[PDB]
Amino acid sequence: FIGKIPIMLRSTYCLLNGLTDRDLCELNECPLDPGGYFIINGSEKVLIA
Amino acid sequence: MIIPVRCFTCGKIVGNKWEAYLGLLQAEYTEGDALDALGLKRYCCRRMLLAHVDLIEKLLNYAPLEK
Amino acid sequence: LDALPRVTCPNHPDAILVEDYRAGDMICPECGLVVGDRVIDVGSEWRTFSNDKATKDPSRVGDSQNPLLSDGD
Amino acid sequence: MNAPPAFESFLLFEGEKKITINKDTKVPNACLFTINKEDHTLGNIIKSQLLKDPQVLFAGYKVPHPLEHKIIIRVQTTPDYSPQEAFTNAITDLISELSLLEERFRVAIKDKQEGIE
Amino acid sequence: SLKQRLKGKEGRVRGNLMGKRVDFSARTVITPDPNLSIDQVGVPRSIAANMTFAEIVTPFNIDRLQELVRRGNSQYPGAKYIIRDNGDRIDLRFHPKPSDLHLQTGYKVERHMCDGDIVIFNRQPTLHKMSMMGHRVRILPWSTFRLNLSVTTPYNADFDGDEMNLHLPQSLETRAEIQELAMVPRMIVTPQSNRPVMGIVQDTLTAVRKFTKRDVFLERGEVMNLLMFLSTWDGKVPQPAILKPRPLWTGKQIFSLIIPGHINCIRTHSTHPDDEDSGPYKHISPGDTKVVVENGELIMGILCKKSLGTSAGSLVHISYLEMGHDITRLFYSNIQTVINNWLLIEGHTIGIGDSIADSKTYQDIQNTIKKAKQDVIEVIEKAHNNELEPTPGNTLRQTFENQVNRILNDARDKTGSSAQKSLSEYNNFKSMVVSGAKGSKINISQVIAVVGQQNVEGKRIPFGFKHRTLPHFIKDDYGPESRGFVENSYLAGLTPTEFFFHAMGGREGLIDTAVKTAETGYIQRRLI
Amino acid sequence: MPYANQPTVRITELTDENVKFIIENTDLAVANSIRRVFIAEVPIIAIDWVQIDANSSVLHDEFIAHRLGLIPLISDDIVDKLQYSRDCTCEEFCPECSVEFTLDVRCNEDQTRHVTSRDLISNSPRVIPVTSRNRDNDPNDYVEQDDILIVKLRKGQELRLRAYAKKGFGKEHAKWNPTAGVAFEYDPDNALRHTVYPKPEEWPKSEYSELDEDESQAPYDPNGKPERFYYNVESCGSLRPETIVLSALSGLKKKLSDLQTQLSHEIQSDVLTIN
Amino acid sequence: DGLKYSLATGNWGDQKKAHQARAGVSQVLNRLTFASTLSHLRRLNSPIGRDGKLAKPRQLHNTLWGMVCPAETPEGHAVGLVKNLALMAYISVGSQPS
Amino acid sequence: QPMIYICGECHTENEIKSRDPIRCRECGYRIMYKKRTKRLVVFDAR
Amino acid sequence: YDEDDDEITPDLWQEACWIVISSYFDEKGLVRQQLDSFDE
Amino acid sequence: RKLRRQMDIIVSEVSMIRDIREREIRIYTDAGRICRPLLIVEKQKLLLKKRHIDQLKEREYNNYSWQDLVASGVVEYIDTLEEETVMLAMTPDDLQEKEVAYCSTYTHCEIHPSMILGVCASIIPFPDHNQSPRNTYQSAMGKQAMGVYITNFHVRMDTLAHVLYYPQKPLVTTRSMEYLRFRELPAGINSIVAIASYTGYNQEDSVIMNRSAVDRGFFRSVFYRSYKEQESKKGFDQEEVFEKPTRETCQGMRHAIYDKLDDDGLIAPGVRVSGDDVIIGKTVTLPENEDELESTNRRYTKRDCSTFLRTSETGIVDQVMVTLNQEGYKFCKIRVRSVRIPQIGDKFASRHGQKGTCGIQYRQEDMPFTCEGITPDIIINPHAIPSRMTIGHLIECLQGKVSANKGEIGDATPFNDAVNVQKISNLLSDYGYHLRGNEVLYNGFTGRKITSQIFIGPTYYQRLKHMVDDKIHSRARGPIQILNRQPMEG
Ligand SMILES: [Mg+2]
Ligand SMILES: [Mg+2]
Ligand SMILES: [Zn+2]
Ligand SMILES: [Zn+2]
Secondary structure (H helix, E strand, O other), X not given: OOOOOOOEXXXXXXXXHHOOHHXXXXXXXXXXXXXXXXXXXXXXXXEOX | OOOOOOOOOOOOOOOOOHHHHHHXXXXXXXXXXXXXXXXXXXXXXXXXXXXXXXXXHHHHHOOOOOO | OOOOOOOOOOOOOOOOOEXXXXXXXXXXXXXXXXXXXXXXXXXXXHHHOOOOOOOOOOOOOOXXXXXXXXXXX | OOXXXXXXXXXXXXXXXXXXXXXXXXXXXXXXXXXXXXXXHHHHHXXXXXXXXXXXXXXXXXXXXXXXXXXXXXXXXXXOOOHHHHHHHHHHHHHHHHHHHHHHHHHHHHOOOOOOX | OHXXXXXXXXXXXXXXXXXXXXXXXXXXXXXXXXXXXXXXXXXXXXXXXXXXXXXXXXXXXXXXXXXXXXXXXXXXXXXXXEEOOOOOEEEOOOXXXXXXXXXXXXXXXXXXXXXXXXXXXXXXXXXXXXXXXXXXXXXXXXXXXXEOHHHHHHHOOOOOOOXXXXXXXXXXXXXXXXXXXXXXXXXXXXXOOOEEOOXXXXXXXXXXXXXXXXXXXEOHHHHHHHHHHOOXXXXXXXXXXXXXXXXXXXXXXXXXXXXXXXXXXXXXXXXXXXXXXXXXXXXXXXXXXXXXXXXXXEEEOOOOHHHHOOOOOOHHHHHHHHOOHHHXXXXXXXXXXXHHHHHHHHOOEOOHHHHOOOHHHHHHHHHHHHHXXXXXXXXXXHHHOOOOOOOOOOOHHHHHHHHHHHHXXXXXXXXXXXXXXXXXXXXXXXXXXXXXXXXXXXXXXXXXXXXXXXXXXXXXXXXXXXXXXXXXXXXXXXXXXXXXXXXXXXXXXXOHHHHHHHHHHHHHHHHHHHHHHHHHHHHXXXXX | OOOOOOOEEEEEEEOOOEEEEEXXXXXXXXXXXXXXXXXXXXXXXXXXXXXXXXXXXXXXXXXXXXXXXXXXXOOOOOHHHOOOOOOOOOOOOOOOOOEEEEEEEEOOOXXXXXXXXXXXXXXXXXXXXXXXXXXXXXXXXXXXXXXXXOEEEOXXXXXXXXXXXXXXXXXXXXXXXXXXXXEEEEOOOOOOOOOOOOOHHHOOOOOOOOOOOOOXXXXXXXXXXXXXXXXXXXXXXXXXXXXXXXXXXXXXXXXHHHHHHHHHHHOOOOOOOOO | OHHHHHHHHOOOOOOOOOOHHHOOOEEEOOOOOHHHHHHHHOEEEOOOOOOOOOOOOXXXXXXXXXXXOOOOOOOOOOOOOEEEEOXXXXXXXXXXXX | OOOOOOOOOOOOOOOOOXXXXXXXXXXXXXXXXXXXXXXXXXXXXX | OXXXXXXXXXXXXXXXXXHHHHXXXXXXXXXXXXXHHHHO | OHHHHOOOOOHHHOEEEEEHHHOEEEEEOXXXXXXXXXXXXXXXXXXXXXXXXXXXXXXXXXXXXXHHHHHOOOEEEEEHHHHOOOOEEOOHHHHHHOOOOXXXXXXXXXXXXXXXXXXXXXXXXXXXXXXXHHHHHXXXXXXXXXOOOOOOOOOOOOOEEEEEOOXXXXXXXXXXXXXXXXXXXXXXXXXXXXXXOOOOOOOOOEEEEEHHHHHOOOOOEEEEEEEEEEOOOOOOOOEEEEOOOOOOOEEOOEOOOOOOOOOOOEOOOOOEOOOOOEEEOEEEEOOOOOOXXXXXXXXXXXXEOOEEOOOOOOOEEXXXXXXXXXXXXXXXXXXXXXXXXXXXXXXXXXXXXXXXXXEEEEOOOOOOOOOOOOOXXXXXXXXXXXXXXXXXXXXXXXXXXXXXXXXXXXOOOOOOOOOHHHHHHHHHHHOOOOOOOEEOOEOOXXXXXXXXXXXXXXXXXXXXXXXXXXXXXXXXXXXXXXXXXXXXXX
16 A cells, blocks of 8 residues: 545545446435536645646 | 426416326426417416426435435 | 733733724624734734735745654754 | 515504605705605505696606605696695596595496396 | 836836736726616625725724624625734634634734725726726626716716726725825816816606706606605605696706706807807897806796806806815715706617708708719810919819819718708717717718718728729729719718728728827826 | 596406406506506415424425415415405414415335325315316316426435415515406507507517508507507416405505505695695 | 655655645535536646736637637636636547557 | 434434544544524525 | 449539538548547 | 548558658648548549448438448548648539539548537637627537536536526527537527617627516526535544534634524525525534643534524525545535526627626517517617627528528528528518518607617527626725735635
8 A cells, every 4th residue: 555546536446436316316415516626625626727 | 397386477376287287298298378278378387387496306306315 | 011912901911802803803702992002913924915816925035844754953 | 585475565553654745946936755665556646636627737746666666646736726735636637536436336337237146 | 137127117117016917806898787876886895805905903893893793705795814913824614613713803804805894996007197096896796897877978978888897905004095185076077178077868858958948847746756766865856847737847846856956057059050150149038048046946948068067167167166076976976867857758769761862962961962063174174275273272183083072072061061951850870969079060961961082091082093092994084983972972872982982981980090009008008 | 637638448358367357448557557466466375484393305494485485376265355464463473364284295105206286285175276286277288287396306315394475575585476467558559659550560569569460560649648558467376366356456546545544644734735 | 655745744755755736636516506516627727937927828829629618717826727617528548559 | 302413324313422432433534514403494486 | 332334423412412421420420530639 | 642532541540741852751540630521522523422421311211320431531630730732622613613623633532621620619600790708708608608507407406507408499590519419418498589769778798788687587597506514533632524604612703693403413405594504513523632621611512613594695505415525434425505686787698709797678569569569688789790790690680580480490500601681581571571671660658659679589598607686895994814914815
C-alpha cells in the first residue's frame, strides 16, 4: 500500500459506473447527475480545463 | 414536482384534471383534443397542464421507504 | 479605574452585564447606562475580508503555527 | 419580512378614521373628500355618479400612491348647492340603482330555469 | 512589511485614512416609483427603523418626543435611545418602565427616521458631482429604495437590479448644508456643460409626444381625471378647444396647465419632420411639427427630446433659469403624473407587428441587395484583370477594400432609408424612435431591413484560417458574405456564418466595455 | 335622483359552472366595479390555518400547507352565518367563526398512494365539504374526481395534520376567489373608437360582433356612449355562479351603505358645510 | 496527502516549487441549477497576466468555429478569457505514436 | 427524556439519552437525524 | 443493410439527422472530455 | 485517410494534415486537441445513406450504435488544424445546389449548424433573432436561474441551495434541449406576459407583476442553508462540547436566547428560528484551573463559541444530522428551509437576457384583462425591446402562443426553413387571434379598453438567485475594528 488516489465521480474506477438507473436511485444518488468531478473533504471539486 | 392546484394566471382549478389527462394520452393520441375533452378551453390553462413536468416520480423512486 | 472586569455600573452594583453584539454596545439589564469599549470578539476583525481576492490570502498577518504542540513560536 | 400583513390592505386601524372632509381655499363652494383604506373599486364608481349629476361643476378622484391605500375625491358644485349633498345623493341613488339591478337580476334568474338551485 | 501596509489600495493613506468605511449607512436594490417627487426617496420600514437621528429636546417639542419615548422601540415611529446631558446614554428596550424615565430640556433623543429627514443617496462608482445628491425619505412597504424615474439619468441607474448607497447625516449643521447645497432641485442644471442634467425619459417621454399631437381630444370626464393628479392647479378648468357638438380639450391645451405660466421658449422643434432647412419657409403652412411656447402655453407642435429633454435650451432648462428650482421641481413631478395617467387610458406597446413590413418593400430591398452584390462581383472582376487603377492616396489592396466598403455601406443605407419610409404612422417602433425615447434609425434598419457588414478593429472579418474566414468558404473569397456581411435581418433570422460573424462584432463591444471602466477610473483620479 | 339610469339585465346561458349575461342601460364604471367585486369582494370559505403533526412525504411542510389553502370549498351554506375571525368574541378560533378539517393517511400497501380531497374530512357537519364527490359526480364522470393530488406517499411514509377554514375575500389572498375567471366586454363593434385599429380587416370578429354580419367592419357613431355590457362569469366550483353575482351585488351594497353611515356620522356632530 | 492537498486548495505543485503558475485550476462545483453544473463541467480556461492585458487573446478568433461556444463568457473581468466547449466538441486523450 | 435519533437507513430509534457513541446498533450506518419535535408549529396556508 | 448498387434514392430528409446527433449524445457522455482523460 | 476510416489507426486520437504549398505532412497523436464530428462527403454526395438511418432507429432493440456509425467511415473527427484544410459544406441542400453554385469540391459536411453552440447558448430560443451581446448576457443569467438542480436534493446538504416549487419545461423548445435533460429538470416558468407601458411602474428594465399569481404559488420557491459545526479536542487542554449553554457555567453571555436548544446542544427539526436564535450550543473548556485563588463563582470553567444567527430573518429548521467527520470527531449539519415569495426587488429574466427587477405587484383585479379575462402575470416595458433588439423575445412569444393553442410544444431551432415570421403568423390567425399577437386589452382601473392593442402571450421566465432580502443592509454604530477602530466590512 503506497497511497490514496482521489476518484473522479462515475469514471471507470468510481463504483457507480456499473449500475443502472434503478440501482443508483436505490443508492440515493441521482441518475441524471453528470459526474466527472472529484469529491474532497465533503466538497465536490471540479477541474477547469 | 406535482401539479399546481389552480392555474397561476386565471384561477381555474387544474389538479382535478391531471391524471385524467395522462390516462387519456396513454389511451388516445390527440393531445390537442385531449386537452379539449378535459375542458381547459383557454391557453393559459392549456400551458399549465401542457407544459408541466411530473418530477415527483423520480423523488418517490428513491430508496427512502424510510424517509 | 483599574477595577473594570465588567463591574463598572455607577448607579448600582452589577450582577450581570449583557453584550448587544448588533449595537456594538455594553448594556446593563436593570437600568440603562452603556459603558462601551466594544470588544466584538476583536478576533473577528482580521476575518472580516472574504469577497476580495484571497485563497492564497495576501492580507494575512499571522500564521497559526500550531502553538499547542510547541514551546516556541 | 418587510412586507405588511395582507389584511392591512383594507382593515381600518383603531386610531385612524374612515372619512375626512376638508374645504378648499382656491375656489368657492368646493370640497375635497378623503376616504381611507379603499381602492379604485369604490372611488371610480362614485366619481362617475357625481359626474352624471348636472349640478356638479367638477368631480374627480385619485389614489396618490398604490402602496398606501387611500383615495381622494375632489368635487365642486354651483354656489347654491353644497358638494356634501351631491355626494350624499350620488351614493343613495347608486345604492338604489344597484338594488334595482339586484331585484331585476333575481327575477331574470327565476325565469324558467329549474337549475337555479 | 510596514511599507507595503502603507502603500496604495488598502494602504494606510489611500485605502483607509483618505477613504474609511462609515457608520449610518444603508444599501439596497432600486425600483422605479412615478409617485414620488424628484427630490424624494422611498425607504423600507426596516431600514428606516434601524437607523437613527439625534434630536435634542427643546421646551416646545418635548411633549411630542416624550410620546416618542413612550412608543418605545417595538413599534415603528419610536425612539432607540435617550442621552442625558450628564453624558449617559440609555437604551429604550431594556428599561421596564420608560414612563418613569421623565425627559427634560438638554437630553438628546435618538429617534427612528421619519417621513422628511434628508439623506445623501449615492451610486458608485461616483463619476461626477451629480452622482451623489440629497433627498427627502418617504417610508413605504417592501424592501428597496424607491426613487422617481427621472433621477435615473444623473445616476446612470437602470432598475435592472442596480444597487444604491444611502447615508444619513446626524447634526443640524450637516442637514442644513445638505439641504441647501446637495439637494436634487439644486442639482438640475449641470456646471459641467451648462445643460439640464435630467430630462423626461422612457414612457413619459414617449407618452408625451403622442399626447401633444393635435389629433388627440379628451371628453370632460377624462379632462377632470388628469386635472385631478396635477398639484399646482389653479382651480379653474380651462375653456375647451371645441365647444360643440360636444365639449373637448386638445392635448396641447391640457399640457399648457402643467408648465409654469411664464416660460417663453421659441424654436426647439427639430424632430426629423417638417423639413431640413427651408421647406416650411416655402409658403408658411405654419405647420405643426415646430414647437412654440408663449406666455406659458404650448401653442403649436408636439414634444420630444429636442423640446422636453436634456438639451440645453429645453422647457426644463428655460423654466429652471426663469422660474427657479422649486417651481421646476413641481413641474417635473406634475409632467410625469398627468402624462403617465393619460398614457394609462392610451397604452403603448411593441409586438412583432412593428417590425414586419410589406411584400413590395422586401422585393425592393432584395433587388437592392442583388444590385450591390453584382457590383461587388464587378469590382472583383475588374480587380483580377489588373485594371482597377489605384486611388492616388492608397495601394491597390487598400483601394479595393475602401471601394467594396463604400458600396456595401451604400447598400445598407439605401435599404435602411427605404424601410423607414415604407413604415406607417401607427408603428410603435417609430413612436419610440421619434420621441427620442430609445433606439435609433439604424436600429430600425437592423430589425427589418438588413444588418450589414460586421466589423473588427476597423476592418472586415480577418482571415483567421489561411486565406479564409471560416472553413465553409472557398479560398481567397473577397465577396460580401465570406468577409462577414450579414444579408438578412433580425426579423428574418441570420444564417450560420452571419450568426458567427455577428458574434465576432458583438464581442468587440464586450472587451471595450470591460477595459474602459479601468482607464477612465484611473485618468479621472490623476486629475482630481 | 333624476339621473339614475335604470339598468336592465338579461340572462343568456346558465349551467353548473357558467353564467353568461348582458347588462344594459348602466354606466361603464358600474360594469367595471361589479366585475372587480366578483374577483375581490365576494366572500367565501377556504382553508387558512394548517398545523402539521407528522409529515414524511417527499414534499416539504409549507408546500403541503400551500396546496391545502388553494382547494375550493363548497360554501353553498350561507357564509354569512360564519363571522370573520377578527370580530368574534372567541379566543383564536371557534365553531362559530371557523370550520375544522382533519387529514390522516399512511401508505401500508406496496403500491403508490394518492392523497386527495375525499380523504380530507370536515369535523364540522356535512354542509361545508371539499368540492370533490359530495352533492354528486354529475353523470359527467371526472374518472377519479380526485379534486387534487395533495401529495404522493410510499410504504412507510405518512401524513397527519389539522386545518381550520375561515371566511375571507379575494382582495386579501387569491385562495379566497369565487371565480376561476370572468369575461367582460363592451361595444364589440368598436362603434365608439375607444380602441383604434390599424388595418381593421385583420381582426377576427368577436362572438357578439355578429349583428350586421357585414364584412364592412365597424360602423362609426360619434354621439354614442357605453351601453350593453357582456359578461361571462365562470365559477371555480366553490359556489354556484348566480349565487356569486347576487352575493357580490349585496356585499357591495353593504359596502356603500357603510360609507353612507360613516358619512352621516361625520355630520351627526358638527354640520361640516353639509349645506 | 500531496494530491489531496492540491485538489482541495486549488494551489499547484507540492508548495515548494511555487503555486502561482496554476492558480484556480481546481474549483468547487457550482450547482445552482442543473444547467449550471453541466456548464462548469464544460468550462475551459485561458491563462493571462492579471487584471488588464488587452490584446488579441481575448476576442473571438475564427478557428473557434465548432470547438468553443461563440457566445458564452463572463460579463466582466475575464470577458473572453473564460471559454466553453460547444456541444459536439471533443478533446483527444492522446495515444502512443508507435 | 430520550432524544430518539432516527438512524441513517433503517430508521429504528436508538434511544440515545446519554454520552454514548452515536452509532446505531444493529445497523452499520452512523449518520443520524434528530426527528421532528412533538412540539406543534402553525402554518398559515397563505 | 446497405449495398450501394440497388440503392436509387440516397437522399434523406436532413430533419432525420437528429437521429444521428442523438446517437452521438446517447453514446458519448455529455461530458466525456473530463472522464476520458481521467480514465486515460 | 483510408486506414483511419478503416479503424487501423485510432480515429479520435489521430489527426492528419497535408500543407501542400509547403510540401509537408504533419500528423499528431498528442492529447489536448479539440476536435468535432463531421460527415464525410465523397463524389459530391453524402457517404451516409438512409439505410444507416433505419439501422439507427432499429437500436430500440438493436446493439448498433454511434461507434458502428464511425466504423462505417461515414463520419470522422476533425481537429482545428485539420479544419483549416477541409472544404466544409453548410448543408446537404447547398451540396445539391452546387450545380449552379460556385463550389463543387466539398469534403465534409456539417451534421447541423446549431451545434456550434455551447450548453447555455443552447437553452435559449431563436438566438439568431437576438442582437449578439444578448446571447452572452443570457448564458451568464442562465447559470443564475434557480431550479430543481438535481433530483435527490432532499438528501443533499449543499451549503446553500435554491429550489423552485413548480418548474415547467419550456413551452417553445430548442431541439438541443432534448439532450440537456432540460425537459426533465427545468429552470423557470411559462408565464403570461404583456409588453405594455401600464401605470409605468415598470420603466427602465423592471416589471409589473400579477399578485394573485405569486399567491397561487407562481414562482414561489424554497431556500435551504446548511450550517455545520464541529466539536474538536484540538489541543492538550481544550475541549469543545455540544451542550445547553447556561449563564451559570458558560462564558459567552451573548444575549441571544439559548432556550430553544435541546438538552443535547442543538435544536430539533421543525422549530422556528429567527435573526437571534441559537441553532447549536458549543462550548470551549479552556483553562481548567490556570486562574488560581477562587476564580470559580460562574462563567469560569469554559467559554462559549456556539453558532447562531447574524445571517437573516430566516425560516424553519428542516433537518439536523449528527454524525462523525473524517477526523473521527462528533460533527453536525443543520439545514434551515425558507420560502421566498417573489416580491418587489427580486430579479428575473426571460431567456433573451431581458433580466429585470420587479417594480410593483398588482392583484388580479387591476391587471389589464382580455376578452376571456387572461390577466398578465408580468408586464415588460416596451422600451426594453428597440435599443436592445431582442426580436427573438417577440418570436419566442408568438411561437409560444401557437403552442398553447395547438397544445403542441413548438420549436425554436436557430437554423431551419420554417420561415418563422409568415408561417407562424398564418397559424396563429387560423386559431382565431390577431395573426401577429396583439389582443384588445381593457383597463383594470376604469374598465375602458386600452386604445392601442397589446402584444400579449406566453414566455418562459427565470427567477434568479439574487433575491432582494439577501442584498438589503444597514448600520448604526455596531462593531468596531480595534486594530483600526472603524466599522466592519458589511
Ligand atoms: Mg445603469
Ligand atoms: Mg436607464
Ligand atoms: Zn384562460
Ligand atoms: Zn366568530
